[PDB]
Design a protein around this ligand. Structure first.
Ligand SMILES: Nc1ncnc2c1ncn2[C@@H]1O[C@H](COP(=O)(O)OP(=O)(O)O)[C@@H](O)[C@H]1O
Ligand SMILES: Nc1ncnc2c1ncn2[C@@H]1O[C@H](COP(=O)(O)OP(=O)(O)O)[C@@H](O)[C@H]1O
Ligand SMILES: [Cl-]
Ligand SMILES: [Mg+2]
Ligand SMILES: [Mg+2]
Lengths: 121, 233, 237, 122
């Protein structure tokens, strides 16, 4: 029922996050880069976006930026899931509109708890 | 000189080892917490991911170790009669999975008829081939339908001439004189998300020069690159 | 003039390889065994082997966080964030975290406070926990080879309008010529009693810079074959 | 007629996984945390195979291999060295000290077991 846009350039990462997401009964739409992610937003409006930062073509910081510039997009909660471990990376992502930043490597169980918290309420 | 680029190198090791570790940790914890929710083929697929990601991690530690061995002059090569046509075929086999992962085709043509004979260390020259092949994939074009890496074999100057050609992002002319040095990586918008240490070509160069050979490059930005490896017999 | 730092850099690169190889060996061997022994594994052993993979990944993660924190400190991007916190709980939390590693090498982890708890202090709890864990790990790593009464003790006290933390061990000790070099990046004591002990020589350099970002200092007293005391002084406010 | 294997490594984590793969074939396993303990265990029994780490506290594996060649009842016991030391010179030293095979860590458990079988079967 709940629809999640999963944005990451690693097929290996998408597969494990998608598996843990589908364990909760969520629908999953994948995007290999930030540009593809934005093209997919014309088909549907997800309940949650899970967003990588480092991607070719278009990175996740500019995805977050363009999400604030649209009216329907700006309210969609976003969890940044990223190998970028700096406090300044987190701060940039939060001020760009992200609700939560989680570092890789990550606990799948913690990630799912946080996915739930943004979806429920 | 080396002390400048050492800090970036340390961060680069961190970033490249982080990616397989993320997969290892995420896949292992998922298996552990989802034993009731995994069918047999998915359990085995997930275990294979852990295994294949460990192997990439192992390749990256062998890079660090080979470099410390080369810097210490601890690496003594051992030469023997080898078929380079089989060596090159064996090398392109090993790189196929990583190549299809980034939609890069891998090719092999020999100008001279096979099999070609040479007095080389098969393990170390295999290591040279794979580093050039890996690079051809790593630095290929972003969105292109005809991406490739070709290994071309030929006999010249009383020796073997291996060419590895790509149609990737190319190398700026100022960077052409520095790609072989330890820790050096071209810093740009087209290599921001590409992992690496800047050790591969330094290891390749030192190995090639231990065989009394040389390596050089020709590149145009936006077109591609050719790496030439000359080794005698 | 002095290309010793380049030689220490080459040692450091080999040491990263050695420290990361050990958990990787476990990960690979345990995963391949599970993959090939599903018909022969009982459930408790399957889960046990998965837990090893998970715990070995976690040690690997901590070693990668050491390399990243050092580069962050070297670039001066790591900017601390202070808040009020109890150091009695912080120290307790740290010794809890090091308990499994300590019992692995038969090392008792003790905690004393010369003043009554709780001791309030204005510090970054994440970064001071990182300082504590590095000193506790070192206490276990450089303990005697074979002895019955191994220990690492954290002693806490309030001094000089500030907090003084002592980490005491009864391990191998440190020579005098190495005492003024143990805080340097990449430096490790080379001897028969440190040959099998993994590490990068980054821990104490990270600890030193974290401590000095708080406006504090760290120093050492040690006798060879007896033990070592690491003193950490932080201002309270 | 179970083949007995002396397993010498300072890592409990390493011993457990090698011991599991060994016991899958039906071999008995005796563990040792260092080289000194390994040699003390040889008074109790004589193994058909010794699996030997190099880097251990108290006594290392080069020293163990050396002491195996001195005694005539040991000198004949095959040894697989299984070690994190990946140098060609480390391998060469192990083989000159009387080790039959040297395997690097990380290792494939199935290749390790394949080589264990080879040495136990003539
Ligand atoms: N085939 C190629 N095409 C374009 N650039 C390349 C190629 N091979 C190497 N390079 C450049 O040379 C640098 C050094 O390569 P290498 O020594 O293998 O280290 P790494 O691949 O870890 O960066 C790379 O960072 C890249 O900028
Ligand atoms: N408690 C201790 N007892 C004896 N020696 C120590 C202790 N703590 C640190 N050392 C010495 O100082 C060196 C540097 O320590 P550290 O910076 O943590 O690096 P590492 O532990 O990776 O070697 C160690 O290599 C060791 O020789
Ligand atoms: Cl290989
Ligand atoms: Mg990415
Ligand atoms: Mg060992």
């Amino acid at each position: 029922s709940k629809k999640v846009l999963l944005v990451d350039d690693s097929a290996v990462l998408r597969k494990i996050v998608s598996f843990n997401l589908k364990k909760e009964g969520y629908e999953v739409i994948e995007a290999e880069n930030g540009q593809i992610a934005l093209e997919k937003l014309s088909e549907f409006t997800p309940d949650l976006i899970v967003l990588d930062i480092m991607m070719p073509v278009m990175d996740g910081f500019t995805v977050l930026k363009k999400l604030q510039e649209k009216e329907e997009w700006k309210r969609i909660p976003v969890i940044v899931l990223t190998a970028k471990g700096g406090e300044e990376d987190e701060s940039l992502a939060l001020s760009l509109g992200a609700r939560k930043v989680m570092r890789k490597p990550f606990s799948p169980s913690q990630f799912i708890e946080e996915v739930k918290h943004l979806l429920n309420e | 000189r080396i002390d400048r680029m050492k800090t970036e190198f340390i961060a680069n090791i961190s970033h490249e080892l982080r990616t397989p570790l993320t997969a290892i940790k995420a896949y292992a914890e998922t298996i552990y917490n989802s034993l009731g929710e995994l069918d047999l083929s998915t359990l085995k697929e997930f275990l294979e991911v852990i295994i294949d990601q460990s192997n990439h991690l192992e390749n990256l530690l062998n890079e660090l170790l080979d470099f410390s061995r080369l810097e210490r002059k601890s690496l003594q090569i051992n030469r023997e009669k080898v078929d380079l046509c089989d060596l090159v075929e064996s090398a392109v086999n090993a790189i196929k999975e990583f190549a299809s992962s980034h939609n890069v085709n891998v090719l092999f043509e020999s100008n001279v008829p096979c099999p070609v004979e040479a007095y080389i260390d098969p393990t170390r020259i295999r290591q040279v081939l794979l580093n050039l092949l890996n690079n051809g994939v790593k630095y290929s074009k972003k969105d292109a339908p005809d991406k490739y890496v070709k290994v071309i074999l030929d006999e010249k100057d009383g020796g073997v001439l291996i060419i590895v050609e790509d149609n990737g992002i190319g190398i700026p002319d100022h960077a052409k004189d520095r790609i072989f040095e330890q820790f050096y990586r071209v810093d740009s918008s087209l290599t921001y998300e590409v992992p690496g240490t800047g050790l591969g070509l330094a290891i390749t160069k030192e190995i090639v020069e231990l065989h009394g050979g040389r390596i050089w490059v020709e590149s145009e930005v936006g077109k591609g690159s050719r790496f030439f490896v000359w080794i005698p017999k």
